[PDB]
Ligand binder design. Structure first.
Ligand SMILES: Cc1ccc(-c2cnc(Nc3ccc(OCCCN4CCN(C)CC4)cc3)c(C(N)=O)n2)cc1C
Ligand code: NA
Length: 161
């Protein structure tokens, strides 16, 4: 889908994955940031995406609609004592970069939806908030924070168990 609905679906797919970590009791929070550069960042404190050829978990990111319909995608993993960077340039992956040391675990997915593919690229804060309100309500005790850098709109979603 190439409209505002299909654009918002890119957010739904990234968030559904982060929320799966929470359901499973690995993640406690999800942070969604709508940037001023056209990108969306989804951060969780889960296990970190692991760093046949179709046994490589990162391949699920590479083959996804989010990576296909994005000019750029940045996957940042905090796992196995290190920070890891797996970047894609127009769906094409770069080499896996091993950064600094960390005791933390988690996944950050940042994607720039293709302005040629979508005739809008303008996310709707209310639509995102509607989806994120459902994510927190289905996962009682999970904290979800939504921030929009474009206008300073901020919301916290938490339902106490
Ligand atoms: C667009 C998109 C974005 C994120 C993800 C994604 C995938 N896996 C994830 N999580 C995840 C974490 C741990 C994990 O471990 C699986 C068990 C251990 N592996 C067994 C196979 N081995 C080769 C490696 C280790 C699998 C998935 C997460 C996330 N946000 O946590 N996101 C998927 C898609 C399609
Ligand atoms: Na964690």
């Amino acid at each position: 889908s190439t409209g505002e609905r299909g654009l918002h679906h890119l957010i739904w797919e990234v968030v559904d994955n982060a929320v799966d970590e929470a359901m499973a009791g690995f993640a406690t929070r999800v942070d969604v940031k709508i940037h001023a550069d056209g990108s969306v960042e989804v951060r969780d404190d889960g296990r970190g995406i692991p760093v046949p050829t179709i046994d490589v978990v990162m391949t699920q990111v590479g083959v996804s609609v989010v990576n296909a319909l994005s000019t750029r995608l940045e996957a940042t993993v905090l796992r196995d004592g290190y920070e890891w960077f797996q970047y894609y340039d127009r769906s094409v992956p770069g080499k896996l970069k091993q950064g600094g040391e960390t005791k933390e675990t988690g996944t950050t997915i940042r994607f720039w939806a293709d302005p040629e593919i979508f005739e809008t690229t303008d996310y709707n804060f209310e639509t995102v908030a509607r989806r994120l309100q459902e994510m927190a309500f289905l996962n009682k005790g999970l904290t979800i924070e939504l921030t929009d850098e474009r206008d300073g709109k901020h919301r916290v979603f938490h339902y106490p168990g």
